[PDB]
Motif scaffolding. Structure first.
Motif, PDB file in Angstrom:
ATOM      1  N   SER A 209       0.820  -1.203   0.000  1.00  0.00           N
ATOM      2  CA  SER A 209       0.000   0.000   0.000  1.00  0.00           C
ATOM      3  C   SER A 209       0.858   1.257   0.000  1.00  0.00           C
ATOM      4  CB  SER A 209      -0.946  -0.019   1.200  1.00  0.00           C
ATOM      5  OG  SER A 209      -1.964   0.956   1.061  1.00  0.00           O
TER       6      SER A 209
ATOM      7  N   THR B  14     -10.107   2.759  -6.478  1.00  0.00           N
ATOM      8  CA  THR B  14      -9.690   1.360  -6.533  1.00  0.00           C
ATOM      9  C   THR B  14      -8.644   1.056  -5.466  1.00  0.00           C
ATOM     10  OG1 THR B  14      -8.081   1.900  -8.259  1.00  0.00           O
ATOM     11  CG2 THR B  14     -10.254   1.115  -8.966  1.00  0.00           C
ATOM     12  N   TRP B  15      -7.694   1.972  -5.260  1.00  0.00           N
ATOM     13  CA  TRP B  15      -6.694   1.782  -4.214  1.00  0.00           C
ATOM     14  C   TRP B  15      -7.326   1.781  -2.828  1.00  0.00           C
ATOM     15  CZ3 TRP B  15      -5.100   5.734  -0.699  1.00  0.00           C
ATOM     16  CH2 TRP B  15      -4.018   5.386   0.119  1.00  0.00           C
TER      17      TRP B  15
ATOM     18  N   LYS C 189      -8.948  -1.536  -2.393  1.00  0.00           N
ATOM     19  CA  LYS C 189      -8.025  -2.665  -2.359  1.00  0.00           C
ATOM     20  C   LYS C 189      -7.573  -2.984  -0.939  1.00  0.00           C
ATOM     21  CE  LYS C 189      -4.048  -4.388  -4.984  1.00  0.00           C
ATOM     22  NZ  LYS C 189      -2.946  -3.973  -5.894  1.00  0.00           N
ATOM     23  N   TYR C 190      -7.298  -1.963  -0.133  1.00  0.00           N
ATOM     24  CA  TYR C 190      -6.700  -2.145   1.180  1.00  0.00           C
ATOM     25  C   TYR C 190      -7.681  -1.778   2.287  1.00  0.00           C
ATOM     26  CZ  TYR C 190      -2.390  -2.436  -1.507  1.00  0.00           C
ATOM     27  OH  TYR C 190      -1.419  -2.797  -2.411  1.00  0.00           O
TER      28      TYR C 190
END
Length: 71
Positions: A4, A24-25, A28-29
């Motif tokens: 990340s 999206t990032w 993702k995390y």
């Protein structure tokens, strides 16, 4: 956290962040991870700006960090 921060260091050293890749990032995390990555990126950027500002206010990149945070 390693992956990340590798992504958000790319995100921070840029302007006009694309909303799609940012979302999206974020997806993702995990929330703890995304907050920690943001804090780590900001801390490293401020540290490198202060290191580059050793002479004084000449060639101040702190304004760039503030503009990145605003964007």
């Amino acid at each position: 956290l390693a992956e990340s921060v590798t992504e958000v260091e790319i995100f921070g050293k840029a302007t006009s962040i694309d909303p799609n890749t940012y979302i999206t990032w974020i997806d993702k995390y995990q929330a703890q991870l995304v907050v920690l990555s943001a804090q780590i990126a900001w801390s490293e950027n401020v540290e490198t700006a202060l290191s580059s500002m050793g002479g004084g206010g000449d060639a101040a990149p702190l304004h760039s960090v503030l503009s990145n945070v605003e964007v």
